[PDB]
Design an enzyme around this catalytic site. Structure first.
Site, short mmCIF file in Angstrom:
data_model
loop_
_atom_site.label_atom_id
_atom_site.label_comp_id
_atom_site.label_asym_id
_atom_site.label_seq_id
_atom_site.Cartn_x
_atom_site.Cartn_y
_atom_site.Cartn_z
N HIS A 155 93.66 125.35 -17.72
CA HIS A 155 94.14 125.14 -16.38
C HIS A 155 94.94 123.81 -16.27
O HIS A 155 96.11 123.77 -15.86
CB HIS A 155 93.03 125.18 -15.37
CG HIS A 155 93.49 124.96 -13.95
ND1 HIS A 155 93.53 125.96 -12.99
CD2 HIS A 155 93.97 123.83 -13.33
CE1 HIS A 155 94.00 125.46 -11.86
NE2 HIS A 155 94.25 124.15 -12.03
N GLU A 156 94.27 122.72 -16.59
CA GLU A 156 94.89 121.41 -16.44
C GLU A 156 96.13 121.27 -17.30
O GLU A 156 97.13 120.74 -16.86
CB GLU A 156 93.92 120.27 -16.75
CG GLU A 156 92.69 120.26 -15.89
CD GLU A 156 92.91 120.52 -14.41
OE1 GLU A 156 92.07 121.16 -13.80
OE2 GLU A 156 93.89 120.05 -13.83
N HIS A 206 99.41 122.80 -16.04
CA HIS A 206 100.09 121.96 -15.09
C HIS A 206 101.11 120.97 -15.75
O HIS A 206 102.02 120.50 -15.09
CB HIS A 206 99.12 121.17 -14.26
CG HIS A 206 98.46 121.91 -13.14
ND1 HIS A 206 99.18 122.58 -12.17
CD2 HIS A 206 97.16 122.03 -12.80
CE1 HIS A 206 98.33 123.10 -11.29
NE2 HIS A 206 97.10 122.79 -11.63
N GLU A 220 98.84 125.72 -7.79
CA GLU A 220 97.44 125.95 -8.18
C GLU A 220 97.21 127.43 -8.52
O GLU A 220 96.38 127.77 -9.35
CB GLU A 220 96.45 125.46 -7.12
CG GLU A 220 96.45 123.95 -6.93
CD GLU A 220 96.10 123.14 -8.22
OE1 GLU A 220 96.26 121.92 -8.20
OE2 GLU A 220 95.67 123.67 -9.24
N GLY A 235 86.11 117.45 -10.10
CA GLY A 235 86.10 118.46 -11.14
C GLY A 235 87.08 118.25 -12.30
O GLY A 235 86.63 118.15 -13.47
N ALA A 236 88.39 118.33 -12.00
CA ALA A 236 89.45 118.01 -12.98
C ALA A 236 90.77 117.68 -12.29
O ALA A 236 91.09 118.26 -11.23
CB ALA A 236 89.65 119.14 -13.94
N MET A 237 91.58 116.81 -12.88
CA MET A 237 92.84 116.42 -12.31
C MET A 237 93.94 116.27 -13.34
O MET A 237 93.77 115.59 -14.32
CB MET A 237 92.66 115.18 -11.41
CG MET A 237 93.94 114.72 -10.83
SD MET A 237 94.72 115.97 -9.77
CE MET A 237 96.43 115.59 -10.01
N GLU A 238 95.08 116.91 -13.07
CA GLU A 238 96.09 117.14 -14.07
C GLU A 238 97.06 115.95 -14.33
O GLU A 238 98.23 116.17 -14.69
CB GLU A 238 96.88 118.44 -13.77
CG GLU A 238 97.81 118.40 -12.61
CD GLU A 238 97.21 118.78 -11.26
OE1 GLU A 238 95.96 118.89 -11.18
OE2 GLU A 238 97.97 118.94 -10.28
N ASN A 239 96.59 114.71 -14.16
CA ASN A 239 97.48 113.58 -14.28
C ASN A 239 98.28 113.66 -15.59
O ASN A 239 97.72 113.97 -16.63
CB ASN A 239 96.73 112.23 -14.28
CG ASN A 239 95.61 112.16 -13.29
OD1 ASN A 239 95.85 112.17 -12.08
ND2 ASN A 239 94.38 112.13 -13.78
C1 LIG Z 1 90.91 116.58 -8.22
C2 LIG Z 1 91.37 117.88 -8.78
C3 LIG Z 1 92.63 118.42 -8.16
C4 LIG Z 1 92.27 119.05 -6.81
C5 LIG Z 1 93.38 119.42 -9.10
N1 LIG Z 1 94.74 119.68 -8.64
C6 LIG Z 1 92.52 120.70 -9.25
O1 LIG Z 1 92.90 121.71 -8.72
O2 LIG Z 1 91.49 120.70 -9.96
ZN LIG Z 2 95.29 122.97 -10.85
#
Ligand SMILES: CC[C@H](C)[C@H](N)C(=O)O
Ligand SMILES: [Zn+2]
Ligand SMILES: *[C@@H]1O[C@H](CO)[C@@H](O[C@@H]2O[C@H](CO)[C@@H](O[C@@H]3O[C@H](CO)[C@@H](O)[C@H](O)[C@H]3NC(C)=O)[C@H](O)[C@H]2NC(C)=O)[C@H](O)[C@H]1NC(C)=O
Ligand SMILES: *[C@@H]1O[C@H](CO)[C@@H](O[C@@H]2O[C@H](CO)[C@@H](O[C@@H]3O[C@H](CO)[C@@H](O)[C@H](O)[C@H]3NC(C)=O)[C@H](O)[C@H]2NC(C)=O)[C@H](O)[C@H]1NC(C)=O
Ligand SMILES: *[C@@H]1O[C@H](CO)[C@@H](O[C@@H]2O[C@H](CO)[C@@H](O[C@@H]3O[C@H](CO)[C@@H](O)[C@H](O)[C@H]3NC(C)=O)[C@H](O)[C@H]2NC(C)=O)[C@H](O)[C@H]1NC(C)=O
Ligand SMILES: *[C@@H]1O[C@H](CO)[C@@H](O[C@@H]2O[C@H](CO)[C@@H](O)[C@H](O)[C@H]2NC(C)=O)[C@H](O)[C@H]1NC(C)=O
Ligand SMILES: *[C@@H]1O[C@H](CO)[C@@H](O[C@@H]2O[C@H](CO)[C@@H](O)[C@H](O)[C@H]2NC(C)=O)[C@H](O)[C@H]1NC(C)=O
Ligand SMILES: *[C@@H]1O[C@H](CO)[C@@H](O[C@@H]2O[C@H](CO)[C@@H](O)[C@H](O)[C@H]2NC(C)=O)[C@H](O)[C@H]1NC(C)=O
Ligand SMILES: *[C@@H]1O[C@H](CO)[C@@H](O[C@@H]2O[C@H](CO)[C@@H](O)[C@H](O)[C@H]2NC(C)=O)[C@H](O)[C@H]1NC(C)=O
Ligand SMILES: *[C@@H]1O[C@H](CO)[C@@H](O[C@@H]2O[C@H](CO)[C@@H](O)[C@H](O)[C@H]2NC(C)=O)[C@H](O)[C@H]1NC(C)=O
Ligand SMILES: *[C@@H]1O[C@H](CO)[C@@H](O[C@@H]2O[C@H](CO)[C@@H](O)[C@H](O)[C@H]2NC(C)=O)[C@H](O)[C@H]1NC(C)=O
Ligand SMILES: *[C@@H]1O[C@H](CO)[C@@H](O)[C@H](O)[C@H]1NC(C)=O
Ligand SMILES: *[C@@H]1O[C@H](CO)[C@@H](O)[C@H](O)[C@H]1NC(C)=O
Length: 902
Positions: free
Chosen positions: A321-322, A325, A344, A285-289
């Site tokens: 959201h991302e 972070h 989260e 879905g999404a990842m906050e790198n």
């Molecule tokens: C791969 C996504 C990850 C789980 C991220 N921390 C999220 O909550 O979307």
């Molecule tokens: Zn998150």
């Protein structure tokens, strides 16, 4: 002792300082069809306590280092001991370097390795993603470290608190772009061994966690902006996506969002640039790198020609959201995964704040209530729930860490933090939050640290007074599971709390330190006027005149559902709220108009009010224009539809709903100018979408006419779709429903030639709305054909057919029959037998259907169920529940609907 390499947590004897990491993905298979990457790393670390063993994470890496698996040097003039042997311990995912003597406190060392692993299409570590551009299959290389997959890319001390700086180099084909956390140092230079490759070095990261590293090699292109403080913002995507403009909305909102947060957090964005990248089929879905956020494509891209308003909302909130972070989580990182909820939960809350800044006319802050609060209350009102907090020493394995990523952590975390900010006031919450960010920047924390800094802010002022410390209060909401129902007797102003459970017969076995008592912040409105704020202390019952009414007067608790609890009243007070809602609904906040509905249906489920009282709470809707209260209704009733849509109860249900929604349909008919222009803001667009859905699915002729007229129009001129993307899923579905094979075959054609996922999904689901058995059966016949329906779409389509009352027996028959297909599809790809089973048994509510489910299970000899083995037991239990609920409720519900439909 046990040997430290057999424990899941790292020693604390060695801490990393900095890493050099060079990765080289090979995007061409080695012709037995294997894709690989190669890597070289050096880690510099400091010895804290003498030890003769180096333990570092490694996962699915083969080592080609000269000699042992590593080379070990001393930094500066430190001597280093000789290696005895290096070994890999798979279970705990370790590379283990046994030494002939001890390392020495205060000394630094450098450990070099060379390695390779598979560049698998498995969405873990450094991995490959394949996608189509015209004729060609493209392949790119990208990362997902979250949570414990950094170690799959290079050997590292792969725990969040063991932060270090990272110097990343990618070696890549020279016509591809290389991206990482930081900007490139300069121009790429050719690889000397083979100039077809180039070498991109990146600037040193700040001190950071391994799970936040990213690096990507691809053909992607970007749209760019430079914020006024010289922060470069880019949205990256497939060349064709960028050329179509699909990146523009994300670019539009990103700058405002980053600005909001830097001010909100009182903290400058800590990096020189922000990249965001749309990946095809990114299932995570999404990842906050940090500095390189990854999204699935439909989470970042937006097409104004085909995408609906709810698509637009998803983009702005996922971005907020991302980006949240990038301070909370990345700059200040929770020390261990048992505190994931804080991270989260926080982002899941402030996503609405950030998005509201980008779209300030949309009232987005309201959406947390339906979106997270009520959503998680459904699972938190069960005996089988769990506390936000988990002891650190219980979260050890990668599987255990994974289990932290659930509804409770995100949605309840979000709910309780929002509660906290509200009882502190946002200004006070912000002060404490800035204090926390400044004190812990580039380091690690527990939730206790945040409580502490909030306490400091509380202690530094005189205006907000709490009944206890921030910690003692939040302990009630974090150390025990669930939440209270608050019951008010308005004759006396008595007010009580008990642990709320949807199942009044449930045995709770999980004990609480607090005997399931909370300290509860209670706001209230009386006769539409805010009252003083009240705290329910940790007692079963109390009394206050705030909650005492006269005979004409009413009181309503939990304004805007800022508090994580549900409210019940005496019936008199219920009726007064009802009269108010019928005569001037404007007196009661729109969120509370929804609350009345949400709470009362849950209360009825729990046997705390009669079901007819909850139904009474929908009567006001015939003059309700706004989105939320209607959404509460439709959410609470969808189960009633599921239970009764094949019964004598249904006709009066439809009639009643037709009655309720017709004025809203009329209202939008005028407002929209014969449906030619959408309402301006998001809430009213959402209301229009629901009104049309509700009207049409309940057989209001005027909606049926609208849907046939538009789909007739689209059919006579296929390249110009007249139907606004907001209305598409309804107008498609209703029109295929009224129509025959002409309408079906046409939408089928359109499904085959669609380019956009969101639009393909709407056609696929609308096609299940035919009322011809032969069409639904033919359609089912296709769902296993990968030429016509993608495998990842197959079970979804079958469920959509099951959803159709006519399709129910067709789907159910079809599943039973071709169940003989765990052994093609616990083979070729996963499948989700679990979701399939739930969708197709969802309706079952008689002894007879239970006998069929039992008779079905009796193919236990072989085949089995795979990932739906649990799910098939959950089906037999849910049917039992449904059988019971239908006997208890059918008569009462029938007579209510009959009596209220005219
Ligand atoms: C791969 C996504 C990850 C789980 C991220 N921390 C999220 O909550 O979307
Ligand atoms: Zn998150
Ligand atoms: C982690 O990566 C760093 C970047 O590769 C390494 O630091 C670099 O070391 C390079 C060579 O060791 C230096 O580049 C040039 O090398 C020539 C070799 O003949 C030297 O004369 C020069 O000092 C140098 N040229 C210039 C223009 O500086 C770099 O100085 C240096 N890069 C920096 C400091 O940013 C690290 O050594 C490596 N870490 C480990 C532990 O190996
Ligand atoms: C990391 O090292 C692993 C262990 O050496 C490698 O896994 C091995 O791959 C071998 C070949 O790629 C496979 O062995 C045999 O290969 C030959 C021809 O390649 C075939 O004739 C055989 O059918 C095949 N043998 C069998 C029994 O199937 C092995 O599958 C495998 N060995 C083990 C012990 O797992 C990894 O490929 C390597 N990875 C990287 C990225 O370098
Ligand atoms: C990113 O932000 C841009 C600026 O805020 C938005 O650009 C606006 O796009 C609107 C929709 O295309 C345009 O509105 C109208 O477009 C029709 C097209 O034919 C015209 O008749 C109208 O005159 C025009 N609107 C106005 C108010 O005149 C705007 O022209 C345009 N605004 C600007 C400043 O260029 C983008 O929409 C936005 N991107 C996304 C994907 O949301
Ligand atoms: C990664 O690169 C950075 C910065 O280019 C290196 O940081 C240097 O570290 C050396 C050795 O400790 C110091 O003498 C310099 O002062 C540092 N420069 C800066 C700007 O901080 C870092 O050492 C590299 N990491 C590794 C593992 O080599
Ligand atoms: C980058 O260079 C590669 C290699 O020349 C190009 O890849 C080839 O593209 C054609 C289509 O134009 C394919 O039929 C070939 O099979 C590809 N070769 C390989 C090894 O995959 C690639 O198109 C170039 N990309 C860009 C963005 O310029
Ligand atoms: C963080 O917040 C502080 C406190 O509000 C900001 O400092 C104030 O800035 C305003 C802006 O004109 C001044 O009028 C106040 O006098 C300042 N107070 C203090 C104590 O300096 C600060 O600007 C913010 N910093 C960031 C990076 O956002
Ligand atoms: C985890 O975070 C703590 C802070 O919460 C770090 O401890 C601090 O270290 C800094 C820099 O050395 C000192 O200024 C503080 O005195 C320390 N505070 C403490 C010990 O409470 C700690 O270093 C971090 N852990 C790791 C492994 O990096
Ligand atoms: C409101 O609360 C009070 C208790 O605080 C209830 O009144 C008590 O009822 C018991 C019944 O045995 C008496 O012995 C106590 O002396 C009463 N306390 C008084 C009169 O102060 C009352 O029942 C509650 N009303 C409700 C729940 O509607
Ligand atoms: C309850 O929620 C409503 C929104 O649903 C809040 O009303 C908003 O109030 C803010 C600031 O007071 C305004 O800027 C918004 O425009 C309002 N929106 C609407 C639609 O009225 C209301 O403040 C909340 N009530 C309480 C007590 O917190
Ligand atoms: C809970 O325990 C009681 C025994 O007193 C029993 O009546 C009830 O059936 C049990 N479980 C559930 C889930 O209702
Ligand atoms: C609705 O209630 C508000 C509350 O003050 C009042 O101002 C308004 O006149 C009422 N609207 C109607 C149509 O009476």
């Amino acid at each position: 002792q046990s040997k430290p390499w057999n424990r899941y947590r790292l020693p604390t004897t060695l801490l990393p300082d900095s890493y050099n990491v060079t990765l080289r993905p090979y995007l061409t298979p080695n012709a037995d069809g294997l894709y690989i990457f190669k890597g070289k790393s050096i880690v510099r670390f400091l010895c804290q306590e003498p030890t003769d063993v180096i333990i570092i994470h490694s996962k699915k890496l083969n080592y080609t280092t000269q000699g042992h698996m590593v080379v070990l040097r001393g930094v500066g003039d430190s001597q280093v001991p000789e290696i005895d042997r290096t070994e890999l311990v798979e279970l705990t995912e370790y590379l283990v370097v046994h030494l002939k003597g001890s390392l020495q406190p205060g000394h630094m060392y450098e450990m070099e390795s060379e390695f390779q692993g598979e560049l698998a299409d498995d969405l873990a570590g450094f991995y490959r993603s394949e996608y189509m551009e015209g004729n060609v299959k493209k392949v790119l290389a990208t990362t997902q470290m979250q949570s414990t997959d950094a170690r799959k890319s290079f050997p590292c001390f792969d725990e969040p608190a063991m932060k270090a700086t990272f110097n990343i180099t990618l070696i890549h084909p020279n016509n591809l772009t290389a991206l990482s956390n930081m900007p490139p140092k300069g121009s790429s230079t050719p690889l000397a061994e083979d100039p077809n490759w180039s070498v991109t070095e990146f600037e040193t990261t700040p001190v950071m966690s391994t799970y936040l590293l990213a690096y990507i090699v691809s053909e992607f292109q970007s749209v760019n902006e430079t914020a006024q403080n010289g922060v470069l913002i880019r949205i990256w995507a497939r060349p064709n996506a960028i050329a179509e403009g699909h990146g523009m909305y994300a670019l539009n909102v990103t700058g405002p969002i980053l600005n909001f947060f830097a001010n909100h957090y009182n903290t400058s964005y800590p990096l020189p640039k922000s990249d965001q990248i749309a990946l095809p089929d990114f299932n995570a879905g999404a990842m906050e790198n940090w500095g390189l956020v990854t999204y699935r494509e439909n989470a970042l891209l937006f097409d104004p020609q085909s995408s609906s308003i709810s698509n637009k909302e998803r983009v702005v909130t996922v971005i907020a959201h991302e980006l949240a972070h990038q301070w909370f989580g990345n700059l200040v990182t929770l020390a261990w995964w048992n505190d994931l909820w804080l991270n989260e939960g926080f982002a899941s809350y402030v996503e609405y704040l950030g998005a509201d800044h980008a779209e300030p006319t949309w009232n987005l802050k309201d959406l947390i209530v339906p979106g997270d609060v009520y959503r998680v209350m459904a699972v938190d009102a069960l005996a089988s729930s769990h506390p936000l907090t988990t002891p650190a020493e219980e979260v050890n394995t990668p599987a255990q860490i994974s289990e932290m990523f659930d509804s409770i952590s995100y949605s309840k975390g979000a709910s309780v933090i929002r509660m906290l900010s509200n009882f502190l006031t946002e200004d006070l919450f912000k002060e404490g939050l800035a204090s926390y960010l400044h004190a812990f920047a580039y380091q690690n924390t527990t939730y206790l640290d945040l409580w502490e800094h909030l306490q400091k802010a509380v202690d530094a002022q005189t205006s907000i007074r709490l009944p206890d410390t921030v910690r003692a209060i939040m302990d009630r909401w974090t150390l025990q599971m669930g939440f209270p129902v608050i019951t008010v007797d308005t004759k006396t102003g008595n007010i009580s709390q008990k642990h709320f459970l949807l199942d009044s017969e449930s045995n709770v076995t999980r004990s609480s330190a607090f005997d399931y008592l909370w300290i509860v912040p209670i706001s209230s409105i009386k006769n539409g006027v805010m009252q003083d704020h009240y705290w329910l202390r940790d007692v079963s019952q109390a009394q206050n005149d705030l909650f005492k009414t006269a005979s004409d007067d009413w009181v309503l608790l939990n304004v805007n559902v800022t508090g994580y609890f549900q409210v019940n009243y005496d019936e008199d007070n219920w009726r007064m709220i009802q009269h108010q809602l019928q005569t001037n609904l404007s007196v009661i906040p729109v969120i509370n108009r929804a609350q009345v509905i949400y709470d009362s249906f849950n209360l009825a489920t729990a046997h705390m009010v009669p079901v007819t009282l909850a139904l009474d709470n929908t009567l006001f809707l015939n003059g309700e224009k706004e989105y939320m209260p209607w959404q509460a209704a439709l959410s609470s009733l969808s189960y009633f539809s599921l239970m009764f849509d094949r019964s004598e109860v249904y006709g009066p249900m439809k009639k009643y709903l037709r009655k309720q929604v017709e004025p809203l349909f009329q209202h939008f008919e005028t407002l929209t100018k014969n449906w030619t222009e959408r309402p301006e803001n998001l809430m009213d667009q959402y209301s229009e979408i629901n009104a049309i859905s509700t009207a049409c699915s309940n057989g209001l002729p005027q909606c049926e006419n609208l849907a046939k007229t538009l789909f007739d129009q689209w059919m006579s001129d296929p390249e110009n779709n007249p139907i606004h993307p907001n209305l598409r899923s309804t107008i498609y579905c209703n029109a295929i429903a009224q129509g025959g094979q002409d309408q079906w075959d046409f939408a089928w054609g359109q499904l085959q030639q669609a380019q956009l996922v969101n639009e393909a999904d709407k056609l696929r689901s609308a096609l299940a709305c035919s009322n011809e058995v032969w069409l639904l059966n033919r359609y089912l016949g296709y769902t296993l054909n990968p030429d016509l329906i993608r495998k990842q779409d197959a079970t979804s389509t079958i469920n959509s057919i099951a959803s159709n009352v006519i399709g129910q027996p067709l789907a159910w028959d079809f599943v039973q029959s071709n169940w003989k297909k765990l052994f093609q599809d616990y083979g070729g790809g996963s499948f989700s037998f679990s979701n399939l089973i739930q969708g197709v048994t969802r309706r079952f509510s008689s002894e007879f259907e239970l006998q069929q489910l039992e008779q079905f299970k009796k193919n236990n000899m072989d085949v089995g169920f795979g990932s739906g083995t649990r799910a098939l037991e959950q089906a037999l239990e849910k049917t039992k529940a449904n059988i019971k609920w239908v006997k208890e409720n059918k008569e009462v519900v029938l007579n209510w609907f009959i009596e209220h439909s005219s």
